[PDB]
Amino acid sequence: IQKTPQIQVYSRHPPENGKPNILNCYVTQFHPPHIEIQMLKNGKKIPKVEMSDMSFSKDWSFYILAHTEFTPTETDTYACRVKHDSMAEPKTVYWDRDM
Amino acid sequence: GSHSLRYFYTALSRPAISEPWYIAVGYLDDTQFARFDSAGETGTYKLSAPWVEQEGPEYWARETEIVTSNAQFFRENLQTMLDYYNLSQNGSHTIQVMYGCEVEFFGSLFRAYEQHGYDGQDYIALNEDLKTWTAADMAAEITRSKWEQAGYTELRRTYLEGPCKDSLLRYLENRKKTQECTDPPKTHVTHHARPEGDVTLRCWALGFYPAHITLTWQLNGEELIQDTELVETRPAGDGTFQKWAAVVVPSGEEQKYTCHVYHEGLPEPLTLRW
Amino acid sequence: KPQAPELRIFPKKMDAELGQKVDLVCEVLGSVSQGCSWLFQNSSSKLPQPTFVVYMASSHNKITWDEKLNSSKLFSAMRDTNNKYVLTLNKFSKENEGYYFCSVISNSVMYFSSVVPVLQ
Amino acid sequence: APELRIFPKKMDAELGQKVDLVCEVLGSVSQGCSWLFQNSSSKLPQPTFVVYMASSHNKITWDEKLNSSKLFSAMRDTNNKYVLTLNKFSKENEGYYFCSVISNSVMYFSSVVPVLQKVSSA
Ligand SMILES: *[C@@H]1O[C@H](CO)[C@@H](O)[C@H](O)[C@H]1NC(C)=O
Ligand SMILES: *[C@@H]1O[C@H](CO)[C@@H](O)[C@H](O)[C@H]1NC(C)=O
Numbered sequence: 214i215q216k217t218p219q220i221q222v223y224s225r226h227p228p229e230n231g232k233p234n235i236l237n238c239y240v241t242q243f244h245p246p247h248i249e250i251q252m253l254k255n256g257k258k259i260p261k262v263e264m265s266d267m268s269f270s271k272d273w274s275f276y277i278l279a280h281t282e283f284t285p286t287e288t289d290t291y292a293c294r295v296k297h298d299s300m301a302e303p304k305t306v307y308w309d310r311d312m
Numbered sequence: 313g314s315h316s317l318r319y320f321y322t323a324l325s326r327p328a329i330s331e332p333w334y335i336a337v338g339y340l341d342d343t344q345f346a347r348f349d350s351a352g353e354t355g356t357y358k359l360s361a362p363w364v365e366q367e368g369p370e371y372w373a374r375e376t377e378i379v380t381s382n383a384q385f386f387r388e389n390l391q392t393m394l395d396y397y398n399l400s401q402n403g404s405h406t407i408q409v410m411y412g413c414e415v416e417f418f419g420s421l422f423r424a425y426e427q428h429g430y431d432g433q434d435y436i437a438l439n440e441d442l443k444t445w446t447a448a449d450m451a452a453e454i455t456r457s458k459w460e461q462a463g464y465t466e467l468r469r470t471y472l473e474g475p476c477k478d479s480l481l482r483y484l485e486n487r488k489k490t491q492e493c494t495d496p497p498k499t500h501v502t503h504h505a506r507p508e509g510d511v512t513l514r515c516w517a518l519g520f521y522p523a524h525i526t527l528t529w530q531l532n533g534e535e536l537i538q539d540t541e542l543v544e545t546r547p548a549g550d551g552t553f554q555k556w557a558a559v560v561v562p563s564g565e566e567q568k569y570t571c572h573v574y575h576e577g578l579p580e581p582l583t584l585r586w
Numbered sequence: 587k588p589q590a591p592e593l594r595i596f597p598k599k600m601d602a603e604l605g606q607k608v609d610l611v612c613e614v615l616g617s618v619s620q621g622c623s624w625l626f627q628n629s630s631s632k633l634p635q636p637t638f639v640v641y642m643a644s645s646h647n648k649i650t651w652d653e654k655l656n657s658s659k660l661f662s663a664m665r666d667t668n669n670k671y672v673l674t675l676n677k678f679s680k681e682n683e684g685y686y687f688c689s690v691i692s693n694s695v696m697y698f699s700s701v702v703p704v705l706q
Numbered sequence: 707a708p709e710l711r712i713f714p715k716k717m718d719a720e721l722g723q724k725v726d727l728v729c730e731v732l733g734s735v736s737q738g739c740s741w742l743f744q745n746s747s748s749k750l751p752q753p754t755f756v757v758y759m760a761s762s763h764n765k766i767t768w769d770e771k772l773n774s775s776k777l778f779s780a781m782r783d784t785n786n787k788y789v790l791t792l793n794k795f796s797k798e799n800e801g802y803y804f805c806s807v808i809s810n811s812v813m814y815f816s817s818v819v820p821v822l823q824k825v826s827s828a
């Protein structure tokens with residue numbers, strides 16, 4: 214009846230220490246469609262994050278893209294935490310420049 | 313070569329609250345051109361592509377009330393399923409519908425479809441002949457009877473082979489105007505020290521369009537299909553997509569591996585070495 | 587890799603008379619796998635034993651047939667619309683009667699569709 | 707074309723016992739070996755993936771659907787002999803096992819080894 218969210222956290226363009234960029238949080242494979250997606254800065258929930266219109270795949274599981282602005286720093290932790298009924302606990306995935 | 317026009321409806325049935333009840337999104341291939349939703353007496357719309365404005369406010373106003381009327385119909389058929397399995401009506405449920413058509417200028421192939429899913433599971437789908445339906449459970453067999461009796465199947469076939477197809481070829485002509493044919497991928501390969509020894513060679517493809525693409529790793533001409541890690545193709549956020557393929561290689565043997573990128577916006581497959 | 591591709595095969599069953607054409611469709615959902623292989627288990631085998639029929643690349647037109655079937659005319663392979671792969675039994679025989687299923691690989695793990703009985 | 711040889715030829719297992727399956731890959735192959743099996747008490751013989759062991763480097767990938775890493779141990783030596791040991795035979799592991807290698811896009815299979823429950827008592 215319900216599937217659990219798969220999450221990818223990455224940047225629009227090849228990351229470059231100090232240089233400005235965009236952080237994406239792509240949440241897929243979930244059901245029901247009711248979800249909560251938060252983009253964070255050093256553990257501090259980032260503000261006004263834009264979202265795309267929700268759609269779904271052939272297996273009926275939904276997908277959404279939350280995205281904001283950020284500037285890659287070796288001393289800066291960025292992550293995406295999502296809350297969905299299918300999981301025992303919220304799930305956080307950190308941005309990792311290698312992926 | 314093959315282009316599609318598809319509508320993705322998500323309606324929510326919750327007799328216990330307000331109603332941001334339905335959203336419907338339309339795509340031309342992998343690009344959304346519009347979003348309709350119930351916000352408005354008969355919904356409202358919001359375009360997202362240049363080659364769509366050419367239609368005019370009158371057109372999009374009519375297109376919106378049609379989508380809304382479809383959404384109401386889609387949602388109402390849920391009832392057949394609730395009565396059969398005798399579920400409560402105040403309970404919450406989800407209704408999803410995807411329909412559309414595609415053309416393959418090459419061999420001018422045409423295909424269409426319409427599939428309904430209730431609570432995240434298959435319910436009923438239109439067959440390739442556009443004249444019969446495949447039912448997923450017993451309740452859907454009731455729905456199938458009702459729709460043939462009502463003439464719903466022919467209405468859809470007429471819409472699919474008529475305006476859906478007409479709209480796809482038009483919207484397509486339109487796009488050729490502003491946006492270019494396709495969008496080739498920019499490629500390059502990174503590496504990564506593997507904590508367990510050896511290295512991971514990662515082949516990236518970014519900013520491509522459409523979303524379909526194939527990224528492969530080879531060694532002495534063989535596709536390393538079972539030592540290749542692929543991530544799900546994902547949106548760059550600017551209407552473009554990205555993907556990467558990784559392979560773990562034994563230390564010192566990097567230069568032996570090559571990455572192959574296949575994409576329609578490339579007259580020929582791209583080959584990249586470490 | 588938690589996220590697994592999903593395989594859907596059609597039809598779910600087939601009762602074929604000798605001579606008839608039979609198309610088996612393998613629809614692969616997701617984008618975490620590339621290409622598709624068709625496997626066969628002879629009904630003419632009381633003990634299970636899979637046999638590679640063919641591999642269709644997701645690339646462009648690149649088809650690799652099992653060495654014996656390399657020059658056989660009982661089978662034809664065609665990559666159709668989207669991630670739909672078609673294995674066609676040109677002439678239904680006792681020679682290709684049995685159990686069919688597709689398989690794709692994703693991040694080193696082999697995934698398999700339902701097996702479909704193509705019996706007389 | 708590589709050749710996959712498997713041993714033993716069959717296994718009549720007593721509940722709770724350990725059982726080793728070995729696959730020797732003969733030929734030139736760049737990819738690793740996969741262990742699969744079709745359960746015996748099931749009509750439609752759909753294979754179940756157990757594990758894959760890379761050949762040119764050290765990396766093992768387990769089925770995470772059933773979490774097979776919890777019931778099996780898997781190893782390989784530098785001479786292309788891959789070992790899979792069922793640590794404690796249970797009805798749920800009963801089946802026809804086989805190994806697989808892919809070389810130049812062709813999937814090759816070893817013979818099928820029945821690992822069936824043997825009755826212990828006279
Ligand atoms: C298999 O058959 C094709 C066409 O019949 C032939 O061109 C090819 O050389 C044969 N061997 C291969 C490449 O599998
Ligand atoms: C089993 O299938 C093979 C193809 O893999 C076919 O050549 C063979 O004739 C079949 N076995 C028989 C003869 O029943």
Ligand SMILES: *[C@@H]1O[C@H](CO)[C@@H](O)[C@H](O)[C@H]1NC(C)=O
Nearest residue numbers: 745747748750751752753754
């Ligand atoms: C095979 O594995 C077990 C034993 O029958 C069962 O859980 C499963 O449904 C069976 N069928 C398959 C191949 O999934």
Ligand SMILES: *[C@@H]1O[C@H](CO)[C@@H](O)[C@H](O)[C@H]1NC(C)=O
Nearest residue numbers: 769770771772773774775776
């Ligand atoms: C596999 O095992 C892990 C760790 O023991 C567990 O967290 C996970 O839920 C299991 N996956 C299943 C049962 O599919």
